[PDB]
């Protein structure tokens, strides 16, 4: 079966390419690997190119995909832009059968140079706006914030992806406590320390 070597890719402006490992751990299998990038709207806009976009992997093997900046410096320069790297692993076949291919999909963030706020200071900037049955997360930073373990009192709320200089809203039970806590998933795919939610 196939795995990717990352759960996100941070693409610094100026880099000619970034790499993504694709691994088959099954000596007895061969897969076709078909890869492509979509923008935040699910469209293949060609801002980022993947190569090679189609190849075969036989047995226990690792292949490296290259992701190339083809933006010609045309994306916003004050905030991250969200893309989705998609890697489809197509199995071979040996009657009535349903067969499945697998798409592994991960965040690809284009990150401009010279952002005034450094990335490790982003998570603390999150703020909250609370209504009767909803909670709005406010992200004043240039970075996408992947917010998880979001709690209001003892109530676990939905995960949220809060866009740079943007907001996201989740449902909130009527009984949920006033104390909000949260964590984020960082550049390395790991959980950041629990933080107390601060009101807008």
């Amino acid at each position: 079966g196939v795995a990717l070597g990352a759960t996100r890719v941070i693409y610094p402006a100026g880099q000619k390419q970034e790499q993504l490992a694709v691994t088959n751990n099954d000596e007895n299998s061969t897969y076709l690997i078909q890869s492509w990038v979509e923008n935040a709207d699910g469209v293949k806009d060609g801002r980022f190119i993947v190569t090679p976009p189609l190849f075969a992997m036989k047995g226990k093997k690792e292949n490296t995909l290259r992701i190339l900046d083809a933006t010609n410096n045309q994306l916003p320069q004050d905030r991250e832009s969200l893309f989705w790297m998609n890697v489809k692993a197509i199995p071979s076949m040996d009657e009535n059968t349903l067969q499945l291919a697998i798409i592994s999909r991960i965040k690809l963030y284009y990150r401009p140079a010279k952002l005034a706020l450094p990335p490790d200071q982003a998570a603390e900037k999150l703020r909250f706006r609370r209504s009767a049955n909803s909670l709005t997360l406010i992200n004043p930073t240039p970075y996408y914030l992947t917010v998880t373990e979001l709690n209001a009192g003892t109530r676990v709320l939905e995960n949220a992806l809060v866009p740079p200089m943007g907001e996201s809203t989740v449902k909130l039970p009527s009984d949920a406590g006033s104390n909000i806590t949260y964590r984020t998933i960082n550049d390395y795919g790991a959980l950041t320390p629990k933080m107390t939610g601060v009101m807008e």
């Binding site: 079966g1 990352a6 489809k88 199995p91 009535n96 291919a101 999909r105 991960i106």
Partner: protein, 128 residues
């Protein structure tokens, strides 16, 4: 950090259904830092039912039937659901994670006609 290696099990096969057949999608190994994934199925929807997977159409194919996919609780999985419609599936960090599903056949037209029953679909795992 690494994601999960995925090994999907294949399934061997008006409103009337055949008995559920279980299949798993095994995420193993998984990186130490995995947290959650949004998972969904995409494929060509049956013309009579958008939440049924269409069978391949050949000279010897069956008809009047589509494939229904169910989660472990045997609730229907929405085919081609947008990411916004999907909930998060929690993962045990650094450990094997098994996802359990069922497939069955459902009649779209009576009388159903016999023939080979084959289909393909794509399971997407979006990492948090």
């Amino acid at each position: 950090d690494n994601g999960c290696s995925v090994a999907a099990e294949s399934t061997n096969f008006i409103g009337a259904t055949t008995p559920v057949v279980p299949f798993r999608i095994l995420l193993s190994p998984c990186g130490n830092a995995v947290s959650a994934v949004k998972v969904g199925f995409t494929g060509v929807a049956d013309s009579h039912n958008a939440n049924l997977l269409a069978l391949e159409n050949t000279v010897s194919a069956a008809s009047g039937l589509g494939i229904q996919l169910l989660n472990e609780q045997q609730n229907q999985i929405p085919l081609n659901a947008p990411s916004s419609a999907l909930s998060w599936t929690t993962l045990t960090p650094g450990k094997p994670n098994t996802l359990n599903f069922y497939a069955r056949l459902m009649a779209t037209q009576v009388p159903v006609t016999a023939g080979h029953i084959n289909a393909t679909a794509t399971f997407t795992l979006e990492y948090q």
